[PDB]
Amino acid sequence: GLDSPTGFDSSDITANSFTVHWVAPRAPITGYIIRHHAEHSVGRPRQDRVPPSRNSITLTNLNPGTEYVVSIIAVNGREESPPLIGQQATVSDIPRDLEVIASTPTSLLISWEPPAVSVRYYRITYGETGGNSPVQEFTVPGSKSTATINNIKPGADYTITLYAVTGRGDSPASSKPVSINYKT
């Protein structure tokens, strides 16, 4: 009865949120239904319906680092249409390549791949062997994919672990901590 929505795609993605896009049919509609659900689950899929004046939909509350199948259903009020379903993936929250690029006698330069997500800050822990205490946790001002590691002590094996913290609304979050090694 109407046209099929295609030429769709996905983008504006994130770790706990991501948007999708899709052109409209050659006829007037009343609203499009957007349902999304990871193909790695059998529970009930979430249903997000969008208006007729929206070709994209920002999805949120979604596990970061996972493929989510989104089924787009068209509807002209009491009629129906072909479901423009697609498949995308939520960005990952944990970084990678945690290595040092500058070993100063009192600090080190850490660098990790930049995750396609809005990280608010990272809390890394210092890895000291026999210094005078356990790992030292220090917050990171999301300065960039590389952070600094001063307050270090020379003369003793070392280690480093980062806990990128990502906000989630009334409560932030922190993927698994990636730890590496370092000799002082």
Side-chain angles (χ1 to χ4, degrees):
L2 329 169
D3 270 90
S4 60
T6 29
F8 131 114
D9 212 52
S10 192
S11 76
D12 269 55
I13 293 211
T14 94
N16 40 280
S17 357
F18 84 76
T19 296
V20 211
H21 313 256
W22 72 87
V23 134
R26 298 176 45 220
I29 53 169
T30 67
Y32 267 26
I33 284 60
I34 325 318
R35 167 127 49 137
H36 40 292
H37 72 292
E39 67 132 54
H40 257 210
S41 52
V42 72
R44 288 144 257 159
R46 330 217 166 127
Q47 35 190 146
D48 270 41
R49 326 313 202 37
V50 286
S53 9
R54 290 282 150 74
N55 52 333
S56 58
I57 167 161
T58 330
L59 280 136
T60 53
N61 275 253
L62 324 167
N63 227 43
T66 281
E67 56 236 275
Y68 282 125
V69 187
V70 164
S71 70
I72 306 284
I73 284 52
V75 288
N76 184 26
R78 75 100 46 251
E79 264 283 294
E80 270 186 293
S81 357
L84 168 48
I85 303 201
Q87 310 177 106
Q88 71 286 351
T90 12
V91 198
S92 154
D93 246 44
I94 286 211
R96 73 119 49 241
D97 213 31
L98 201 185
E99 64 192 281
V100 63
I101 67 158
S103 282
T104 23
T106 50
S107 90
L108 336 176
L109 245 174
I110 32 168
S111 76
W112 56 91
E113 292 215 324
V117 306
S118 282
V119 206
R120 37 171 33 244
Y121 94 90
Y122 313 65
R123 54 197 226 129
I124 310 161
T125 61
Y126 271 78
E128 326 177 19
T129 29
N132 57 333
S133 244
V135 315
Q136 230 173 25
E137 75 197 90
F138 73 77
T139 37
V140 166
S143 327
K144 36 177 134 157
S145 359
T146 62
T148 191
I149 300 286
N150 324 341
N151 198 319
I152 203 190
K153 242 275 260 235
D157 225 314
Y158 243 69
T159 282
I160 298 180
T161 335
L162 63 93
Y163 305 62
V165 173
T166 62
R168 327 292 254 195
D170 275 76
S171 285
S174 30
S175 40
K176 132 155 93 150
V178 154
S179 1
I180 64 147
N181 271 101
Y182 184 89
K183 299 246 291 133
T184 70

